[PDB]
Amino acid sequence: FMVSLPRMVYPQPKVLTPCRKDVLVVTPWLAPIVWEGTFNIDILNEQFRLQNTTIGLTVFAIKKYVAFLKLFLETAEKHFMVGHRVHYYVFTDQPAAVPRVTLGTGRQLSVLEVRAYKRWQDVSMRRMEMISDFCERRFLSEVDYLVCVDVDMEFRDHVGVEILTPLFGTLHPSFYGSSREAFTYERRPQSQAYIPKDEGDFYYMGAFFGGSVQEVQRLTRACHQAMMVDQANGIEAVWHDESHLNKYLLRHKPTKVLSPEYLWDQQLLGWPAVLRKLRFTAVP
């Protein structure tokens, strides 16, 4: 049950003037594609705060990648879901190397130890396995949404409830303008991740996906199972769990798609006019 929104004063949406004319803002299956100028964050914040929404953020920091946690967390504190309840789950092989980052009210961090695996095969499947296989009951009890991101990143601008939806992927910054035949999907029919040259909507990046706990567990379970089949069949998808994520999102359409504002690499790609904000970016 959802209470009424309060009275709010904001500019009237104008039916005969689009918010953005330079980009696709809705997919053919009627999922919003989230760009600056498409949303009023005040309305969305009201809608989600009224539900007392809790967002879980999962991040893996293994070996040398623990060095990225301090900037990742400090910038998440400035830009990610501010005003909402947030639970960070940091999965690491080095609990002692996790920095003590000061958190705002209503925000908490849990350090979760991984997990052995000397064989690279199991390391490849570790994230999908851990989100689905081992963390299932924990996430269902603690958060409403799960967001899965890479650690070698920093927040530079607002990333908030505009992304929340049953299931989302993010347009990979190297491919948003590419033809589907150029997408680096897995192309060998022997792989469960296989996508033919005449299929595909978008190329989604493994570095930022999420949705409701239920939908994220479905996605991660399916990808983990598919990866196990590939391993038994002696094949590793060209881009590992990202290849599987792409296959899954082809066959299970996401209910929102994030624009490359949400996963950008300024060193590699600069700052094109189409991006009004650079929100979450690769650390050089």
Short mmCIF file of all heavy atoms in Angstrom, two decimals, residues 80-140:
data_model
loop_
_atom_site.label_atom_id
_atom_site.label_comp_id
_atom_site.label_asym_id
_atom_site.label_seq_id
_atom_site.Cartn_x
_atom_site.Cartn_y
_atom_site.Cartn_z
N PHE A 80 25.61 8.51 -3.80
CA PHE A 80 24.76 7.33 -4.03
C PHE A 80 23.61 7.23 -3.04
O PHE A 80 23.82 7.01 -1.84
CB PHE A 80 25.62 6.07 -3.94
CG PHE A 80 24.87 4.80 -4.22
CD1 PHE A 80 24.55 4.40 -5.52
CD2 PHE A 80 24.51 3.97 -3.17
CE1 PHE A 80 23.85 3.20 -5.75
CE2 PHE A 80 23.81 2.79 -3.40
CZ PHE A 80 23.49 2.40 -4.71
N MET A 81 22.39 7.39 -3.55
CA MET A 81 21.19 7.20 -2.74
C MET A 81 21.14 8.06 -1.48
O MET A 81 20.55 7.65 -0.49
CB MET A 81 21.05 5.73 -2.37
CG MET A 81 21.04 4.79 -3.57
SD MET A 81 19.56 4.97 -4.60
CE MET A 81 20.03 3.93 -5.97
N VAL A 82 21.74 9.26 -1.54
CA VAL A 82 21.75 10.09 -0.33
C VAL A 82 20.33 10.41 0.09
O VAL A 82 19.51 10.83 -0.74
CB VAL A 82 22.57 11.38 -0.52
CG1 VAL A 82 22.44 12.31 0.71
CG2 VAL A 82 24.02 11.02 -0.77
N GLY A 83 20.04 10.16 1.37
CA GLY A 83 18.71 10.41 1.92
C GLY A 83 17.94 9.13 2.13
O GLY A 83 16.92 9.10 2.82
N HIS A 84 18.43 8.06 1.50
CA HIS A 84 17.79 6.75 1.59
C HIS A 84 18.63 5.80 2.42
O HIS A 84 19.79 6.06 2.67
CB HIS A 84 17.55 6.21 0.16
CG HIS A 84 16.56 7.03 -0.62
ND1 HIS A 84 16.93 8.08 -1.44
CD2 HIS A 84 15.21 6.98 -0.65
CE1 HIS A 84 15.84 8.64 -1.93
NE2 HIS A 84 14.79 7.98 -1.49
N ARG A 85 18.04 4.68 2.84
CA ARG A 85 18.79 3.68 3.59
C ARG A 85 19.67 2.91 2.64
O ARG A 85 19.20 2.42 1.62
CB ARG A 85 17.85 2.72 4.30
CG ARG A 85 17.06 3.36 5.41
CD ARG A 85 16.15 2.35 6.09
NE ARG A 85 16.91 1.27 6.71
CZ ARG A 85 16.45 0.50 7.69
NH1 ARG A 85 15.24 0.69 8.20
NH2 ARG A 85 17.22 -0.46 8.19
N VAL A 86 20.94 2.76 3.00
CA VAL A 86 21.91 2.05 2.18
C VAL A 86 22.67 1.03 3.02
O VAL A 86 23.09 1.34 4.14
CB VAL A 86 22.92 3.01 1.50
CG1 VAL A 86 24.06 2.24 0.86
CG2 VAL A 86 22.20 3.91 0.48
N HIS A 87 22.83 -0.17 2.48
CA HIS A 87 23.65 -1.21 3.11
C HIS A 87 24.71 -1.61 2.09
O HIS A 87 24.36 -2.17 1.04
CB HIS A 87 22.80 -2.41 3.49
CG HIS A 87 23.44 -3.32 4.50
ND1 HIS A 87 22.71 -4.00 5.46
CD2 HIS A 87 24.73 -3.67 4.70
CE1 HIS A 87 23.53 -4.71 6.21
NE2 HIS A 87 24.76 -4.54 5.77
N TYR A 88 25.99 -1.32 2.37
CA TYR A 88 27.07 -1.76 1.51
C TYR A 88 27.46 -3.16 1.95
O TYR A 88 27.57 -3.42 3.15
CB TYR A 88 28.31 -0.91 1.68
CG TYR A 88 28.18 0.57 1.42
CD1 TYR A 88 28.09 1.49 2.47
CD2 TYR A 88 28.17 1.06 0.12
CE1 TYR A 88 28.01 2.86 2.23
CE2 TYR A 88 28.09 2.43 -0.12
CZ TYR A 88 28.00 3.32 0.93
OH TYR A 88 27.94 4.68 0.70
N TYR A 89 27.70 -4.03 0.97
CA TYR A 89 28.26 -5.35 1.23
C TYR A 89 29.57 -5.43 0.48
O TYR A 89 29.59 -5.45 -0.75
CB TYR A 89 27.31 -6.43 0.75
CG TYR A 89 25.94 -6.40 1.40
CD1 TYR A 89 24.88 -5.70 0.83
CD2 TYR A 89 25.70 -7.12 2.59
CE1 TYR A 89 23.62 -5.69 1.43
CE2 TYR A 89 24.46 -7.11 3.18
CZ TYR A 89 23.40 -6.41 2.61
OH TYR A 89 22.14 -6.40 3.19
N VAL A 90 30.67 -5.43 1.22
CA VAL A 90 31.99 -5.47 0.63
C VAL A 90 32.50 -6.89 0.73
O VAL A 90 32.73 -7.37 1.84
CB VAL A 90 32.95 -4.52 1.36
CG1 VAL A 90 34.35 -4.70 0.86
CG2 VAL A 90 32.46 -3.06 1.21
N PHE A 91 32.63 -7.56 -0.42
CA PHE A 91 33.16 -8.92 -0.47
C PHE A 91 34.64 -8.86 -0.76
O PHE A 91 35.04 -8.29 -1.75
CB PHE A 91 32.45 -9.69 -1.58
CG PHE A 91 30.99 -9.94 -1.33
CD1 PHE A 91 30.03 -9.02 -1.73
CD2 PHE A 91 30.58 -11.09 -0.69
CE1 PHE A 91 28.68 -9.24 -1.50
CE2 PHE A 91 29.23 -11.33 -0.45
CZ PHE A 91 28.28 -10.40 -0.86
N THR A 92 35.46 -9.44 0.13
CA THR A 92 36.90 -9.29 0.01
C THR A 92 37.65 -10.49 0.56
O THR A 92 37.13 -11.23 1.41
CB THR A 92 37.39 -7.98 0.69
OG1 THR A 92 38.80 -7.83 0.47
CG2 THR A 92 37.11 -8.02 2.19
N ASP A 93 38.88 -10.68 0.07
CA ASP A 93 39.79 -11.68 0.63
C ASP A 93 40.63 -11.10 1.78
O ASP A 93 41.32 -11.85 2.48
CB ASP A 93 40.70 -12.27 -0.46
CG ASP A 93 41.46 -11.22 -1.25
OD1 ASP A 93 41.21 -10.00 -1.07
OD2 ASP A 93 42.33 -11.61 -2.08
N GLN A 94 40.56 -9.78 1.98
CA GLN A 94 41.36 -9.10 3.00
C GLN A 94 40.52 -8.17 3.89
O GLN A 94 40.59 -6.93 3.74
CB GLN A 94 42.47 -8.28 2.34
CG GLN A 94 43.39 -9.03 1.41
CD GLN A 94 43.99 -8.09 0.39
OE1 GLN A 94 44.93 -7.36 0.67
NE2 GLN A 94 43.39 -8.07 -0.80
N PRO A 95 39.74 -8.74 4.82
CA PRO A 95 38.90 -7.89 5.66
C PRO A 95 39.68 -6.75 6.35
O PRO A 95 39.15 -5.65 6.49
CB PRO A 95 38.33 -8.86 6.69
CG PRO A 95 38.34 -10.18 6.00
CD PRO A 95 39.59 -10.17 5.17
N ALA A 96 40.92 -7.02 6.75
CA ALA A 96 41.75 -6.02 7.43
C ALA A 96 42.15 -4.82 6.57
O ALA A 96 42.53 -3.78 7.10
CB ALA A 96 43.00 -6.68 8.02
N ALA A 97 42.07 -4.98 5.25
CA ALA A 97 42.49 -3.91 4.34
C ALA A 97 41.32 -3.01 3.94
O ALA A 97 41.50 -2.04 3.21
CB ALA A 97 43.18 -4.49 3.10
N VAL A 98 40.11 -3.33 4.42
CA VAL A 98 38.94 -2.49 4.15
C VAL A 98 39.08 -1.20 4.96
O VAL A 98 39.21 -1.25 6.19
CB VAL A 98 37.61 -3.20 4.50
CG1 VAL A 98 36.41 -2.28 4.21
CG2 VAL A 98 37.47 -4.51 3.71
N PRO A 99 39.08 -0.04 4.28
CA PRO A 99 39.27 1.24 4.99
C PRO A 99 38.07 1.56 5.89
O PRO A 99 36.95 1.14 5.60
CB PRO A 99 39.34 2.26 3.85
CG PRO A 99 38.56 1.64 2.74
CD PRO A 99 38.88 0.16 2.83
N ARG A 100 38.31 2.29 6.98
CA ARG A 100 37.24 2.71 7.87
C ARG A 100 36.73 4.03 7.31
O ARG A 100 37.34 5.09 7.50
CB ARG A 100 37.75 2.85 9.31
CG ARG A 100 38.82 1.80 9.65
CD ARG A 100 38.50 1.01 10.90
NE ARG A 100 38.92 1.71 12.12
CZ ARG A 100 38.13 2.48 12.86
NH1 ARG A 100 36.86 2.68 12.51
NH2 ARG A 100 38.61 3.06 13.95
N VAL A 101 35.65 3.95 6.56
CA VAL A 101 35.08 5.12 5.91
C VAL A 101 33.90 5.59 6.75
O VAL A 101 33.09 4.79 7.21
CB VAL A 101 34.66 4.80 4.46
CG1 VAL A 101 33.84 5.93 3.84
CG2 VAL A 101 35.89 4.54 3.62
N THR A 102 33.83 6.90 6.97
CA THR A 102 32.77 7.51 7.76
C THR A 102 31.47 7.54 6.97
O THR A 102 31.43 8.07 5.86
CB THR A 102 33.16 8.93 8.14
OG1 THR A 102 34.48 8.90 8.70
CG2 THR A 102 32.17 9.54 9.12
N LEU A 103 30.41 6.99 7.55
CA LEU A 103 29.12 6.85 6.86
C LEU A 103 28.04 7.78 7.41
O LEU A 103 27.98 8.03 8.62
CB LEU A 103 28.65 5.39 6.93
CG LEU A 103 29.58 4.27 6.47
CD1 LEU A 103 28.88 2.91 6.54
CD2 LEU A 103 30.14 4.50 5.08
N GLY A 104 27.18 8.28 6.52
CA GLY A 104 26.06 9.12 6.92
C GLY A 104 25.00 8.32 7.67
O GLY A 104 25.00 7.10 7.65
N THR A 105 24.08 9.02 8.32
CA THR A 105 23.03 8.31 9.07
C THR A 105 22.20 7.41 8.13
O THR A 105 21.96 7.75 6.97
CB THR A 105 22.13 9.29 9.88
OG1 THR A 105 21.29 8.52 10.75
CG2 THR A 105 21.28 10.15 8.98
N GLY A 106 21.78 6.24 8.64
CA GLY A 106 20.94 5.33 7.87
C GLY A 106 21.71 4.50 6.86
O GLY A 106 21.10 3.85 6.01
N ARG A 107 23.03 4.51 6.96
CA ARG A 107 23.89 3.80 6.03
C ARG A 107 24.82 2.88 6.82
O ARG A 107 25.40 3.29 7.83
CB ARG A 107 24.69 4.79 5.19
CG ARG A 107 23.78 5.80 4.50
CD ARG A 107 24.50 6.89 3.76
NE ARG A 107 25.18 6.39 2.56
CZ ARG A 107 24.71 6.55 1.33
NH1 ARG A 107 23.52 7.12 1.15
NH2 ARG A 107 25.42 6.10 0.30
N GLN A 108 24.99 1.65 6.34
CA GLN A 108 25.82 0.69 7.04
C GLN A 108 26.66 -0.13 6.09
O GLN A 108 26.35 -0.23 4.91
CB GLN A 108 25.00 -0.21 7.98
CG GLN A 108 23.99 -1.07 7.32
CD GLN A 108 23.34 -2.05 8.30
OE1 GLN A 108 24.01 -2.92 8.86
NE2 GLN A 108 22.05 -1.90 8.51
N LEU A 109 27.74 -0.71 6.61
CA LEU A 109 28.63 -1.50 5.80
C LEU A 109 28.90 -2.82 6.48
O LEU A 109 29.17 -2.88 7.68
CB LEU A 109 29.92 -0.72 5.56
CG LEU A 109 30.92 -1.35 4.60
CD1 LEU A 109 31.61 -0.29 3.76
CD2 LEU A 109 31.94 -2.18 5.39
N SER A 110 28.84 -3.89 5.69
CA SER A 110 29.20 -5.23 6.15
C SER A 110 30.37 -5.73 5.32
O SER A 110 30.35 -5.62 4.10
CB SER A 110 28.02 -6.20 6.00
OG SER A 110 26.91 -5.82 6.79
N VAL A 111 31.37 -6.30 5.98
CA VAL A 111 32.52 -6.90 5.30
C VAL A 111 32.30 -8.40 5.28
O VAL A 111 32.14 -9.02 6.33
CB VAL A 111 33.84 -6.56 6.03
CG1 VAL A 111 35.03 -7.25 5.35
CG2 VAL A 111 34.05 -5.05 6.07
N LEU A 112 32.29 -8.97 4.07
CA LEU A 112 32.06 -10.41 3.88
C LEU A 112 33.29 -11.03 3.28
O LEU A 112 33.79 -10.59 2.24
CB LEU A 112 30.83 -10.69 2.99
CG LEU A 112 29.38 -10.40 3.42
CD1 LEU A 112 29.02 -11.00 4.78
CD2 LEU A 112 29.05 -8.90 3.36
N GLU A 113 33.80 -12.06 3.93
CA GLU A 113 35.03 -12.69 3.51
C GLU A 113 34.75 -13.71 2.41
O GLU A 113 33.80 -14.50 2.52
CB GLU A 113 35.72 -13.37 4.70
CG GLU A 113 37.21 -13.53 4.52
CD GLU A 113 37.92 -14.02 5.77
OE1 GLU A 113 37.32 -14.00 6.88
OE2 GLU A 113 39.09 -14.43 5.63
N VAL A 114 35.55 -13.65 1.35
CA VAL A 114 35.63 -14.68 0.32
C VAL A 114 36.97 -15.41 0.54
O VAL A 114 37.92 -14.77 0.97
CB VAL A 114 35.57 -14.07 -1.12
CG1 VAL A 114 34.60 -12.88 -1.20
CG2 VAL A 114 36.94 -13.65 -1.60
N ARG A 115 37.11 -16.72 0.27
CA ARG A 115 36.14 -17.76 -0.15
C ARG A 115 36.95 -18.85 -0.86
O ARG A 115 36.38 -19.74 -1.50
CB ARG A 115 35.02 -17.27 -1.07
CG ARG A 115 33.72 -16.95 -0.36
CD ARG A 115 32.95 -18.17 0.08
NE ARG A 115 31.76 -17.78 0.85
CZ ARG A 115 30.72 -18.57 1.09
NH1 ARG A 115 30.68 -19.81 0.61
NH2 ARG A 115 29.70 -18.11 1.80
N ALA A 116 38.28 -18.75 -0.72
CA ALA A 116 39.26 -19.67 -1.31
C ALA A 116 39.41 -19.55 -2.83
O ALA A 116 39.84 -18.51 -3.33
CB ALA A 116 39.00 -21.14 -0.87
N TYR A 117 39.06 -20.62 -3.54
CA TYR A 117 39.17 -20.72 -5.00
C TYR A 117 40.56 -20.42 -5.55
O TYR A 117 40.93 -19.26 -5.79
CB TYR A 117 38.10 -19.86 -5.70
CG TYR A 117 36.69 -20.18 -5.28
CD1 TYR A 117 35.71 -19.19 -5.26
CD2 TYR A 117 36.31 -21.49 -4.93
CE1 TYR A 117 34.40 -19.48 -4.88
CE2 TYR A 117 35.01 -21.79 -4.55
CZ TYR A 117 34.06 -20.78 -4.53
OH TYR A 117 32.77 -21.08 -4.15
N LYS A 118 41.34 -21.48 -5.75
CA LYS A 118 42.65 -21.36 -6.37
C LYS A 118 42.54 -21.48 -7.89
O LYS A 118 43.38 -20.94 -8.62
CB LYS A 118 43.64 -22.39 -5.79
CG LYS A 118 43.72 -22.36 -4.26
CD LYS A 118 45.14 -22.64 -3.74
CE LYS A 118 45.99 -21.37 -3.74
NZ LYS A 118 47.28 -21.54 -3.01
N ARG A 119 41.49 -22.15 -8.36
CA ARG A 119 41.24 -22.26 -9.80
C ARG A 119 40.47 -21.07 -10.36
O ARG A 119 39.44 -20.67 -9.82
CB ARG A 119 40.58 -23.59 -10.19
CG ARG A 119 40.06 -24.46 -9.05
CD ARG A 119 39.80 -25.90 -9.52
NE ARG A 119 39.18 -25.96 -10.84
CZ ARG A 119 37.86 -25.94 -11.07
NH1 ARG A 119 37.01 -25.87 -10.05
NH2 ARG A 119 37.41 -26.00 -12.31
N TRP A 120 41.00 -20.52 -11.45
CA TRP A 120 40.45 -19.32 -12.10
C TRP A 120 38.99 -19.48 -12.54
O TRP A 120 38.26 -18.49 -12.64
CB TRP A 120 41.33 -18.91 -13.29
CG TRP A 120 41.24 -19.85 -14.47
CD1 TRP A 120 42.08 -20.90 -14.75
CD2 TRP A 120 40.27 -19.83 -15.52
NE1 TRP A 120 41.69 -21.53 -15.91
CE2 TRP A 120 40.58 -20.89 -16.41
CE3 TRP A 120 39.16 -19.02 -15.81
CZ2 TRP A 120 39.82 -21.16 -17.55
CZ3 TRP A 120 38.41 -19.29 -16.95
CH2 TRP A 120 38.74 -20.35 -17.80
N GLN A 121 38.59 -20.72 -12.81
CA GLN A 121 37.22 -21.04 -13.22
C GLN A 121 36.23 -20.59 -12.16
O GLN A 121 35.21 -19.95 -12.46
CB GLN A 121 37.07 -22.55 -13.48
CG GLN A 121 37.79 -23.08 -14.73
CD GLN A 121 39.10 -23.79 -14.41
OE1 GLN A 121 39.41 -24.84 -14.98
NE2 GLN A 121 39.86 -23.24 -13.47
N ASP A 122 36.54 -20.92 -10.91
CA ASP A 122 35.69 -20.60 -9.76
C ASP A 122 35.74 -19.12 -9.42
O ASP A 122 34.73 -18.54 -9.03
CB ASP A 122 36.08 -21.46 -8.55
CG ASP A 122 35.83 -22.94 -8.78
OD1 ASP A 122 34.85 -23.28 -9.48
OD2 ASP A 122 36.62 -23.77 -8.26
N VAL A 123 36.92 -18.52 -9.57
CA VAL A 123 37.07 -17.08 -9.45
C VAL A 123 36.16 -16.35 -10.46
O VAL A 123 35.51 -15.36 -10.12
CB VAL A 123 38.54 -16.64 -9.60
CG1 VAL A 123 38.66 -15.12 -9.72
CG2 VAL A 123 39.36 -17.15 -8.41
N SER A 124 36.10 -16.85 -11.70
CA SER A 124 35.25 -16.25 -12.74
C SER A 124 33.77 -16.26 -12.37
O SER A 124 33.04 -15.31 -12.67
CB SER A 124 35.44 -16.96 -14.09
OG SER A 124 34.66 -16.34 -15.10
N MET A 125 33.35 -17.34 -11.72
CA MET A 125 31.95 -17.53 -11.34
C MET A 125 31.63 -16.98 -9.96
O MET A 125 30.47 -17.00 -9.56
CB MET A 125 31.60 -19.02 -11.36
CG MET A 125 31.66 -19.65 -12.73
SD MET A 125 31.05 -21.36 -12.69
CE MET A 125 32.16 -22.08 -11.48
N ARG A 126 32.66 -16.53 -9.23
CA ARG A 126 32.51 -16.17 -7.82
C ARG A 126 31.44 -15.12 -7.55
O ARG A 126 30.62 -15.29 -6.64
CB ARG A 126 33.86 -15.72 -7.25
CG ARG A 126 33.78 -15.01 -5.91
CD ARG A 126 35.07 -14.26 -5.63
NE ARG A 126 36.10 -15.16 -5.12
CZ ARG A 126 37.41 -15.00 -5.30
NH1 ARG A 126 37.88 -13.99 -6.02
NH2 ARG A 126 38.24 -15.88 -4.77
N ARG A 127 31.41 -14.05 -8.34
CA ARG A 127 30.43 -13.01 -8.05
C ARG A 127 29.00 -13.52 -8.23
O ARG A 127 28.16 -13.32 -7.37
CB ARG A 127 30.65 -11.76 -8.88
CG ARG A 127 29.66 -10.66 -8.52
CD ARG A 127 28.53 -10.57 -9.52
NE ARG A 127 29.07 -10.18 -10.82
CZ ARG A 127 29.46 -8.95 -11.13
NH1 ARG A 127 29.33 -7.96 -10.24
NH2 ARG A 127 29.96 -8.70 -12.33
N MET A 128 28.74 -14.17 -9.36
CA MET A 128 27.40 -14.67 -9.64
C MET A 128 27.01 -15.72 -8.59
O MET A 128 25.88 -15.71 -8.10
CB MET A 128 27.29 -15.25 -11.05
CG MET A 128 27.42 -14.21 -12.18
SD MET A 128 26.14 -12.94 -12.07
CE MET A 128 26.45 -11.91 -13.50
N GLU A 129 27.94 -16.60 -8.24
CA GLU A 129 27.72 -17.61 -7.20
C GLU A 129 27.41 -16.98 -5.85
O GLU A 129 26.52 -17.42 -5.13
CB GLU A 129 28.94 -18.53 -7.07
CG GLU A 129 28.78 -19.64 -6.02
CD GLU A 129 30.10 -20.33 -5.68
OE1 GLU A 129 31.16 -19.68 -5.73
OE2 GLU A 129 30.05 -21.54 -5.35
N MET A 130 28.17 -15.95 -5.48
CA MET A 130 28.01 -15.37 -4.15
C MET A 130 26.74 -14.54 -3.96
O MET A 130 26.14 -14.55 -2.89
CB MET A 130 29.26 -14.62 -3.72
CG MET A 130 30.37 -15.60 -3.36
SD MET A 130 31.75 -14.89 -2.45
CE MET A 130 31.04 -14.72 -0.81
N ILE A 131 26.33 -13.83 -5.01
CA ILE A 131 25.09 -13.06 -4.93
C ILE A 131 23.86 -13.97 -4.88
O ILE A 131 22.88 -13.67 -4.18
CB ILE A 131 24.97 -12.02 -6.07
CG1 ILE A 131 26.08 -10.97 -5.95
CG2 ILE A 131 23.59 -11.34 -6.05
CD1 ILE A 131 26.20 -10.06 -7.14
N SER A 132 23.90 -15.09 -5.60
CA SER A 132 22.76 -15.99 -5.68
C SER A 132 22.82 -17.12 -4.65
O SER A 132 21.88 -17.29 -3.85
CB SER A 132 22.63 -16.58 -7.09
OG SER A 132 23.70 -17.46 -7.38
N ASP A 133 23.94 -17.84 -4.66
CA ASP A 133 24.13 -19.10 -3.92
C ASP A 133 24.22 -18.93 -2.40
O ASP A 133 23.56 -19.66 -1.65
CB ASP A 133 25.42 -19.77 -4.45
CG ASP A 133 25.32 -21.27 -4.51
OD1 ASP A 133 25.26 -21.92 -3.44
OD2 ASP A 133 25.34 -21.81 -5.65
N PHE A 134 25.03 -17.97 -1.95
CA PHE A 134 25.38 -17.84 -0.52
C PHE A 134 24.71 -16.67 0.22
O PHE A 134 24.64 -16.68 1.46
CB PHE A 134 26.90 -17.72 -0.34
CG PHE A 134 27.70 -18.81 -1.00
CD1 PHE A 134 28.78 -18.49 -1.81
CD2 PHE A 134 27.39 -20.15 -0.81
CE1 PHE A 134 29.54 -19.49 -2.43
CE2 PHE A 134 28.13 -21.16 -1.42
CZ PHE A 134 29.21 -20.83 -2.23
N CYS A 135 24.24 -15.67 -0.52
CA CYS A 135 23.76 -14.42 0.10
C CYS A 135 22.24 -14.22 0.01
O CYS A 135 21.72 -13.18 0.42
CB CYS A 135 24.47 -13.22 -0.51
SG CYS A 135 26.23 -13.14 -0.17
N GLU A 136 21.56 -15.23 -0.51
CA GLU A 136 20.14 -15.17 -0.83
C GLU A 136 19.23 -14.70 0.31
O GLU A 136 18.55 -13.66 0.19
CB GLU A 136 19.71 -16.55 -1.32
CG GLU A 136 18.43 -16.57 -2.10
CD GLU A 136 18.24 -17.86 -2.87
OE1 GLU A 136 19.09 -18.77 -2.75
OE2 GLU A 136 17.22 -17.95 -3.59
N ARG A 137 19.21 -15.47 1.40
CA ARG A 137 18.39 -15.19 2.58
C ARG A 137 18.77 -13.88 3.26
O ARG A 137 17.92 -13.16 3.79
CB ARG A 137 18.51 -16.32 3.60
CG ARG A 137 18.15 -17.71 3.09
CD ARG A 137 18.33 -18.74 4.21
NE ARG A 137 18.59 -20.09 3.72
CZ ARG A 137 17.71 -21.09 3.72
NH1 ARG A 137 16.48 -20.90 4.18
NH2 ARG A 137 18.06 -22.28 3.25
N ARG A 138 20.07 -13.58 3.25
CA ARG A 138 20.61 -12.37 3.86
C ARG A 138 20.04 -11.12 3.18
O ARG A 138 19.46 -10.25 3.83
CB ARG A 138 22.14 -12.38 3.77
CG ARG A 138 22.84 -11.31 4.59
CD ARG A 138 24.21 -11.04 3.99
NE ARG A 138 25.20 -10.41 4.88
CZ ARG A 138 24.93 -9.69 5.97
NH1 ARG A 138 23.68 -9.46 6.35
NH2 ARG A 138 25.93 -9.18 6.68
N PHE A 139 20.18 -11.05 1.86
CA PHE A 139 19.67 -9.91 1.09
C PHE A 139 18.16 -9.76 1.17
O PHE A 139 17.64 -8.66 1.31
CB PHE A 139 20.09 -10.00 -0.38
CG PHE A 139 21.57 -9.90 -0.61
CD1 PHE A 139 22.17 -10.55 -1.68
CD2 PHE A 139 22.36 -9.10 0.21
CE1 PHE A 139 23.53 -10.42 -1.92
CE2 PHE A 139 23.73 -8.99 -0.01
CZ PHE A 139 24.32 -9.65 -1.09
N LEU A 140 17.43 -10.88 1.08
CA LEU A 140 15.98 -10.81 1.17
C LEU A 140 15.52 -10.19 2.49
O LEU A 140 14.52 -9.48 2.53
CB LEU A 140 15.35 -12.20 1.00
CG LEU A 140 15.18 -12.73 -0.42
CD1 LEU A 140 14.89 -14.22 -0.37
CD2 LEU A 140 14.06 -11.98 -1.16
#
